[PDB]
Amino acid sequence: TRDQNGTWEMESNENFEGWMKALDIDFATRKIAVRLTQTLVIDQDGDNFKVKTTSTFWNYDVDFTVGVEFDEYTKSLDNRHVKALVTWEGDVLVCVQKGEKENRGWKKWIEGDKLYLELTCGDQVCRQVFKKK
Numbered sequence: 517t518r519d520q521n522g523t524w525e526m527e528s529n530e531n532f533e534g535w536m537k538a539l540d541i542d543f544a545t546r547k548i549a550v551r552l553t554q555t556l557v558i559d560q561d562g563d564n565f566k567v568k569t570t571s572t573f574w575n576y577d578v579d580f581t582v583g584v585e586f587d588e589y590t591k592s593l594d595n596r597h598v599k600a601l602v603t604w605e606g607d608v609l610v611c612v613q614k615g616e617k618e619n620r621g622w623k624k625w626i627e628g629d630k631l632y633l634e635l636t637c638g639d640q641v642c643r644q645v646f647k648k649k
């Protein structure tokens with residue numbers, strides 16, 4: 517299934533610190549960030565996605581259209597410009613963010629009622645698993 521619609525709650529998070537460090541997120545932010553529960557809310561209609569990740573202190577929101585490149589400013593995540601593209605590889609949603617950082621982007625896919633999110637930057641891979649609310 518490509519259907520990633522829904523409200524998802526984090527259950528797992530391997531190497532979050534290392535991924536944030538790869539983006540040069542400041543020590544004080546990471547120290548608090550590693551403690552927080554995350555909710556991920558996805559609205560998916562055809563190619564049009566609206567993605568919202570929320571926690572007690574910070575959010576990250578992005579809209580995109582599958583198959584359409586977009587010049588993106590990463591806004592308070594890490595304040596960098598990237599050329600972003602989100603496409604399908606089978607039932608895996610693959611984002612590549614071309615810019616300063618190598619191997620930067622993410623992959624989302626569904627297994628049963630769990631959503632898997634691999635976040636990549638440099639040589640760091642962060643793996644998150646969400647369960648559907």
Ligand SMILES: *C/C=C(C)/C=C/C=C(C)/C=C/C1=C(C)CCCC1(C)C
Nearest residue numbers: 549569570571574575576593622624
């Ligand atoms: C497809 C799902 C994506 C692209 C989710 C991205 C999520 C983030 C960039 C999360 C960022 C953070 C928070 C929500 C608070 C904890 C600290 C951050 C900045 C890593």
